[PDB]
Amino acid sequence: NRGTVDFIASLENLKEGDLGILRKLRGARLDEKLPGFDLFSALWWPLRQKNQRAPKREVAWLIAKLFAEFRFEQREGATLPILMGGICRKLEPKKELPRVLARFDQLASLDIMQMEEPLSVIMGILRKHQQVCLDWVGLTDVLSFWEQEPVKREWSDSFIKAYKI
Amino acid sequence: MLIEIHMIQNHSPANLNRDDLGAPKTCYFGGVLRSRISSQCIKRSIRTSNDFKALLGGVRTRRLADLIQQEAGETECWKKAQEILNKCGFKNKDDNTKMLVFMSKDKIKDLARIVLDNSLGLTEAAQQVANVIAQATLAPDIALCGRMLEPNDKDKDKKVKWSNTTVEAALQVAHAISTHIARPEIDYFVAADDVPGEDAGAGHIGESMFASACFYKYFSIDWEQLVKNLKGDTNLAAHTVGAFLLAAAKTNPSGKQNSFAAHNYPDGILVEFKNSPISYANAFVRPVSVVKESDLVEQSIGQLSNYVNDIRLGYYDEQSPVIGFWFSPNNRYPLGYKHSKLASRNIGNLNELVGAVLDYIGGFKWEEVQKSKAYIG
Amino acid sequence: MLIEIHMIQNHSPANLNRDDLGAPKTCYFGGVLRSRISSQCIKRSIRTSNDFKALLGGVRTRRLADLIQQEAGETECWKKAQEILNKCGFKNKDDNTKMLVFMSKDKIKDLARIVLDNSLGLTEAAQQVANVIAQATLAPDIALCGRMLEPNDKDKDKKVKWSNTTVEAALQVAHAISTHIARPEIDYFVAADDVPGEDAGAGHIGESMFASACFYKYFSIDWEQLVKNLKGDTNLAAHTVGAFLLAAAKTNPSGKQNSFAAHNYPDGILVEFKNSPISYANAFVRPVSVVKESDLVEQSIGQLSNYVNDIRLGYYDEQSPVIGFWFSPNNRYPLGYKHSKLASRNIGNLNELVGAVLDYIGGFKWEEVQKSKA
Amino acid sequence: MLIEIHMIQNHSPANLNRDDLGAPKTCYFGGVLRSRISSQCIKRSIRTSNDFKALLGGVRTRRLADLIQQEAGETECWKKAQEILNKCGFKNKDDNTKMLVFMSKDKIKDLARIVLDNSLGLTEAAQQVANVIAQATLAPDIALCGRMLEPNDKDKDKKVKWSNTTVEAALQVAHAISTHIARPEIDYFVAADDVPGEDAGAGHIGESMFASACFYKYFSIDWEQLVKNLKGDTNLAAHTVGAFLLAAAKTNPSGKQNSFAAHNYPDGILVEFKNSPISYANAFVRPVSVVKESDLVEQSIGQLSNYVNDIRLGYYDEQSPVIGFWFSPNNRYPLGYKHSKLASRNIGNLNELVGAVLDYIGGFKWEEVQ
């Protein structure tokens, strides 16, 4: 896609003031506070009116908030299941590993509205283990096409491939 | 007859109950995310509290051998007592001591009289210890929280027989869920070196998760089962009910209360006398959203009052009357002034509420049951 | 017995507490957004003030071997100190050394002796170092603020061989929250080049944030726990409480004050003596809305007075622990023009309030307990 | 002992401090909107003023190599020295160096020696340059203000050697805020053509903004830790205090002064000596509404006197005395608070009060210190 790449580049073009504006609004909707709505509209609407396959409003809002609180540099080949597999194959397999596995597996039963907080938990686990990179574009596409079966199959397959190295 | 206590309680930014990762406990109610406080946390906080100190007559410990060594302690009773209780049936699975016993602590010294003889033996001493442990349940806190004691059949010597060690709990406590969508927040602490050093990337950017929410809490007590569990001590049962209400009102979990100080008293307490338990958590199925014309707590009380009116018109039969008292401090939060008259004794004192509750319960008095105290050690 | 201090303090535009991004710390309370100062910042500001200099008896340090070297006067043991520190098994990963030690400075001298006895075994020296660190709990700041010491079990030789290091803190400090809805703002600054280069017109307009608020601060002190922490030394406990009350009303966080100088003073202090901790932060659950007649601080103190009256008349008990003194500078802000007197002594001076506090504590004088240093 | 200066000023419509778009800087204080002048703007206005021109001995230069070749000649040494500056921790950023350096004005000449040390270049030149940058702080403004100068990373990984370049502070300045609700305005400007025949009919109007307010400024000079930064020079410290008083009393920011011309002078200065800093900005938490009988400045001085007296009889200690003056031109605005006189010595002239502060400081006069 190209709307996603432009959206991510625009998000990384922000400075500390607008990042703080987005950071103050975690856990909130889009139609609540005017400064957040204005910032997100001015960042997203030209891309939507240009590219027909730009990310939807809810997905783009969720990625904007996650980037605000969990600022990671954009890199290719650093998807969420790969990093979760790399982290998960370092703990004992009796107590901690089933807990982290259950936390990762909760995401399959949630829709796109109720997914900011588990993703925040996963990214907090990533940040606790000295991670400084993430693939925002691939995560945005996966969240955009989520209720399908092949996307979840590829998600779990990438997790298994990272876990069984 | 069941005594139902509903509470609306607003809290400061706090981290009262956590999980393994440090985040506050959460749940999904009505499709959205809410903050949660577990039932075991509330029950433990009530059990170990200043207003429940005179009725704490039970201990839940994994080191009964050390307790009896502290109790009797002549020369060597620790090793022999540990061996006796290990042959009783308390299995050492995976080298864990395990099998948390929950007997009343007033009988512990009597157990000393079983472990202070060098001619008794092993299996007979274990049988006597098991017999004195099984029929030791007279305690106000044990009668509320219940107890299950089922030792595994591997370390049992097949000569000691275990009697009934199961007591039905007379207290039901629900998890406390918020009345709005949870908004978790992250605090980025950094430790500072008192002695000056090198300020070149000191690091230690931490993560402390916390949240502030308006909780709905719901407790229920069965009067008949409590009296039966105490073995016919209606005085001690009335003292237990009154001191339980007094403790559950003015107490909080002790989780991270040195960094935060959310020592916030409840803004509304409803007490109802029914014949079937009823939870009013379905009031806050739609999350309460704040406006500029009111606050969070008043809207929560209003929604609760609307739902209480709905469950008081529907599901109502004269064959079982319902009597309730509403308490807010100096009547600062009336019970949803759109229909009013939902309760019958809108008052503004906690001790007057306890007194009125006791008089409805048995015509007791709060100054009379305080001398029916349990083991006060 | 518990001494509770409730403050109302209006601050000029400043940035007293920031996160890793640079924004002022905020929170949600009652569904709206408020400004917030962390309790760690308040505790550190009180502990490292100028009204608390005689009672600063403890050090929280990470380079403890350097301090032992400075107090020892011999270089070589310092090297062995790190070895002993390695033999102490605090931490050797993640944040390099880490595992801050909070202990009294006088026993630092004792530490030097344990590293100056090279005739003793290194394992025995490490054991005695761990022991004397475990006993190092004679300081008024450590008594108030508690102590953490849980080293790493991944660097040990003679199993653990530790002692009891946990100290129950006698002081609880809440996070300060604003009494109104916060209005975070951005300050756009451009650095100016004094040499004429005739360039850099769009010279990287920065973005620094700040805010102003009327905070509510809450402190609680346990008298019996403090006395038990100080080995029953009531002379040091009364002095500690008095100097804490003096330092809490005259010290502000030092974060960004050379450009946002906000050295303000509290407008109203309530000091109560009661056996159970209460918090009046539920007064400002509905945010203070400014009207054209009054100001922010008067409305905040009126709401605080209303809620304190409601709590006092709502949770009345037979102990009657309502003995509380209200302070306002020269009686500028009385505790609400709605009710009767609810404070036993409407005091208009600070040192008179401190003297009354000590007189209620034990009848001691403020000039009588100031002679016990740390 | 701490020296504190509180000023009250009134300004004609000025737009003194500007945002990045063009609007005046505002803030919120007490729940209402106020006009605000930033601390760094005030500090830079005082720093490059006329009365402070004697003690100016530092540069905030972003292009230090230009100053290096601007004195020793031989401009080709730019491509001898600039890369050397890129090795000391300046990262070779988008400009000559995006890390602004604060450094005394004389030591640039010493850097000229590094220019002529072609035999001892590369790492030795960079280390010597770092030594000069770290040991160039004895200046009356760098001692007055701070200097962080944390070098950018991705420097040389071999011998990047740096001392403690951080110099703490001697002066704190708060953001000047109005004592009333601000009322910003738009000046609708148009650009009139000179020759008839424009043939353009549309909306060519423009928007330029301004506001007028009465500001409360608050400075604070630490008498110790300023002499400590000046290495015991008590006379230079006294001269710095006196000239800072002069410049802060008689300098305004040079922002859009060619079109608004608001060179207004303060109508009241309150100087105090105390062991702990107090800010009287909480006097104007309530906005100063204007009555018909008085004006804005008189009401502002009255509320300031009210708060000063309430602080004086409030947080009052016996070991620490407080002595304060009170300046007003020809006693036009006394420190109005009923029959109560607050300051110990009313003063009606500026240089007289400067001499009074200087001779309180320990016997300094405005003649030999300059």
Map chain B to HEC letters.
CEEEEEEEEECCCECCCECCCCCECEEEECCEEEEEECHHHHHHHHHCCHHHHHHCCCCCECCHHHHHHHHCCCCCHHHHHHHHHHHHCCCCHHHCCCCCECCCHHHHHHHHCCCCCCCCCCHHHHHHHHHHHHCCCCCHHHHHHCECCCCCCCCCCCCCCCCCCCECCCEEECCEEECCCCCCEEECCCCCCCCCCCCCCCCCCCCEEEECCEEEEEEEEEHHHHHHHHCCCHHHHHHHHHHHHHHHHCCCCCCCCCCCCCCCCCCEEEEEEECCCCCCHHHHCCCCCCCCCCCHHHHHHHHHHHHHHHHHHCCCCCCCCCEEEEECHHHCCCCCCCCCCCCCCCECCHHHHHHHHHHHHHCCCCCCHHHCCCCCC
Give the pair of three-digit tokens for residue B170. Answer: 């007379």
- Nearest by CB to residue A117, choosing from B20, B31, B33, is B33
Evaluate whether C152 touches C99 at the Cβ level (below 8 Å). yes
Smallest Cα distance from C306 to chain B, Å: 10
Q: Which of residues 164-193 of C touch A (CB under 8 A)?
A: 184, 186
Q: How far apart are CA D56 and CA D70, in angstroms?
A: 19
**Strand ranges, E, within chain A:** 73-74, 133-134
Q: Which residues of A touch C206 (CB under 8 A)?
A: 15
Q: How far apart are CA B319 and CA B275, in angstroms?
A: 10
Collapsing DSSP to helix, strand or coil, D146 comes out as coil
Give the pair of three-digit tokens for residue B124. Answer: 């007979």
Q: How far apart are CA C331 and CA C336, in angstroms?
A: 12
Q: Which residues of B touch A28 (CB under 8 A)?
A: 183
Identify the closest residue of chain A to C26 by CA–CA distance: A24
What angle, 0 to 180 degrees and rounded to 10, lies between the N-to-C axes of helices B64-71 and B77-88? 140
Amino acid (one-letter) located at D333: Y
H or E element that contains D295: none
Query: What's the gap between Cα B304 and its chain centre?
Result: 23
H or E element that contains A68: helix A57-69
Q: How far apart are CA C24 and CA C36, in angstroms?
A: 8
- Nearest by CB to residue B184, choosing from A114, A117, A128, is A117
Q: How far apart are CA C34 and CA A152, in angstroms?
A: 40
A15 touching chain C per CB within 8 A: yes
Identify the closest residue of chain A to C28 by CA–CA distance: A24
Smallest Cα distance from C355 to chain D, Å: 13
Identify the closest residue of chain B to C145 by CA–CA distance: B258
Q: How far apart are CA B142 and CA A46, in angstroms?
A: 66
Identify the closest residue of chain C to B212 by CA–CA distance: C29
Inspect the interface and report whether the beta carbons of D313 and C330 lie closer than 8 Å: yes
Inspect the interface and report whether the beta carbons of B194 and C30 lie closer than 8 Å: no
Identify the closest residue of chain A to C24 by CA–CA distance: A20
Identify the closest residue of chain B to C285 by CA–CA distance: B295
Supply φ then ψ for residue C342, to 5 degrees.
Answer: -115, -10
Cα(first)–Cα(last) distance of chain B, in Å?
A: 32
Q: Which residues of C touch B211 (CB under 8 A)?
A: 28
Query: Which residues does A13 contact at the CB level (< 8 Å), separation at least 6?
Result: none
> Of the candidates D261, D287, D259, D271, which has an alpha carbon nearest to the alpha carbon of residue D35?
D287
Experimental method: cryo-EM
- Nearest by CB to residue D314, choosing from C180, C290, C330, is C330
DSSP line for C298-315: HHHHHHHHHHHHHHHHHS
Inspect the interface and report whether the beta carbons of B183 and A26 lie closer than 8 Å: yes
Evaluate whether B2 touches B225 at the Cβ level (below 8 Å). no
A128 touching chain C per CB within 8 A: no
Give the pair of three-digit tokens for residue B106. Answer: 């007033």
A152 touching chain C per CB within 8 A: no
A77 touching chain B per CB within 8 A: no
Q: Which of residues 21-60 of C touch A (CB under 8 A)?
A: 21-23, 26, 28, 33
Q: How far apart are CA A134 and CA A80, in angstroms?
A: 7
Give the pair of three-digit tokens for residue B68. Answer: 């009896």
- Nearest by CB to residue C330, choosing from D95, D171, D310, is D310
**Contact present, C and D (at least 3 Cβ pairs less than 8 Å):** yes
- Nearest by CB to residue C30, choosing from B185, B189, B290, is B290
Give the alpha-carbon dihedral of C68, C73, C75, C78, to 10 degrees: -10
Inspect the interface and report whether the beta carbons of B262 and C30 lie closer than 8 Å: no
Evaluate whether D359 touches D307 at the Cβ level (below 8 Å). no
Amino acid (one-letter) located at A78: A
Q: What is the resolution of this structure in A?
A: 3.1
Residue with tokens 């946990």, as numbered in its chain: C166
Q: How far apart are CA B349 and CA B325, in angstroms?
A: 11
Supply φ then ψ for residue B344, to 5 degrees.
Answer: -130, -15
Cβ neighbourhood burial of C363 (10 Å; 0-12, 13-18, 19+): exposed
Smallest Cα distance from C47 to chain B, Å: 10
**Strand ranges, E, within D98-222:** 103-104, 171-173, 176-178, 185-187, 208-210, 214-222
Inspect the interface and report whether the beta carbons of A117 and B32 lie closer than 8 Å: no
User: Interface partners of D (3+ CB pairs, < 8 Å)?
Assistant: C
D120 vs C144, D117, D124, D125, CA distance in Å? 58, 5, 6, 6
- Nearest by CB to residue C258, choosing from D172, D218, D318, is D172
Report CA Rg, chain A.
16
Give the pair of three-digit tokens for residue D97. Answer: 């160096």
Smallest Cα distance from A114 to chain B, Å: 7
Q: Which residues of C touch D276 (CB under 8 A)?
A: 50, 250, 263
> Of the candidates C350, C33, C312, B349, which has an alpha carbon nearest to the alpha carbon of residue D314?
C350
Inspect the interface and report whether the beta carbons of B32 and A114 lie closer than 8 Å: yes
Inspect the interface and report whether the beta carbons of C62 and B197 lie closer than 8 Å: yes
Q: How does strand A133-134 pair with strand A73-74?
A: parallel
Cβ neighbourhood burial of D348 (10 Å; 0-12, 13-18, 19+): middle
Q: How does strand C323-327 pair with strand C345-347?
A: parallel
Best B186, B259, B293 residue to mutate vs chain C (most C CBs within 10 Å): B259
Supply φ then ψ for residue B216, to 5 degrees.
Answer: -105, 120
A20 touching chain C per CB within 8 A: yes
B266 vs B250, B262, B336, C317, D59, CA distance in Å? 8, 11, 16, 16, 61
Supply φ then ψ for residue D57, to 5 degrees.
Answer: -140, 30
User: Interface partners of B (3+ CB pairs, < 8 Å)?
Assistant: A, C
Amino acid (one-letter) located at C202: A
Q: How far apart are CA C6 and CA C281, in angstroms?
A: 10
A117 touching chain B per CB within 8 A: yes
Give the pair of three-digit tokens for residue D185. Answer: 């305005």
Residue C345 has a CB neighbour count (10 Å cut-off) of 16
Smallest Cα distance from D310 to chain C, Å: 6
Evaluate whether B306 touches B282 at the Cβ level (below 8 Å). no
Evaluate whether B242 touches B352 at the Cβ level (below 8 Å). no
- Nearest by CB to residue A114, choosing from B21, B23, B33, is B33
Collapsing DSSP to helix, strand or coil, C241 comes out as helix
- Nearest by CB to residue B185, choosing from C27, C169, C174, is C27
B207 touching chain A per CB within 8 A: yes
Give the pair of three-digit tokens for residue A65. Answer: 């908030």
What angle, 0 to 180 degrees and rounded to 10, lies between the N-to-C axes of helices C234-248 and C39-47? 120
- Nearest by CB to residue C172, choosing from B187, B188, B258, is B258
Q: Which residues of B touch A120 (CB under 8 A)?
A: 184
- With vertex at residue C82, the alpha carbon angle to CA C80 and CA C87, rounded to the nearest 5 degrees, is 90
Q: How does strand A73-74 pair with strand C214-222?
A: unpaired
D27 touching chain C per CB within 8 A: yes
Smallest Cα distance from C309 to chain D, Å: 25
Inspect the interface and report whether the beta carbons of C316 and B180 lie closer than 8 Å: no
Q: How far apart are CA D169 and CA D181, in angstroms?
A: 33
Residue A6 has a CB neighbour count (10 Å cut-off) of 16
Supply φ then ψ for residue C32, to 5 degrees.
Answer: -115, 170
Cβ neighbourhood burial of B111 (10 Å; 0-12, 13-18, 19+): buried
